[PDB]
Amino acid sequence: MRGSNAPQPSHISKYILRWRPKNSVGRWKEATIPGHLNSYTIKGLKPGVVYEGQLISIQQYGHQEVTRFDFTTTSTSTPGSRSHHHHHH
Numbered sequence: 001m002r003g004s005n006a007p008q009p010s011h012i013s014k015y016i017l018r019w020r021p022k023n024s025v026g027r028w029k030e031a032t033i034p035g036h037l038n039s040y041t042i043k044g045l046k047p048g049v050v051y052e053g054q055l056i057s058i059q060q061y062g063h064q065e066v067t068r069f070d071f072t073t074t075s076t077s078t079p080g081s082r083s084h085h086h087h088h089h
Helices: none
Strands: 014-021 029-033 051-058 066-071
Touching: none
Parallel strands: none
Antiparallel strands: 014 029, 014 051, 051 066
């Protein structure tokens, strides 16, 4: 019910999630998740605050995918053109 480890599966060897308070300017943190094994979302934040999220994928040789996203909690923001496509799901 938690999550099983998948060493070098059909997906990426492992994904790296780094986040840090962009409004509180603090230290970053790392969370490795090998591909999309399940729904994993980091919470514990609050409305009116923006964090920074960077998902970098790592392979057997290191350095794979690099994605930058905006972070928010119970607030409606996350500006980055995330709503301009037809059809859902």
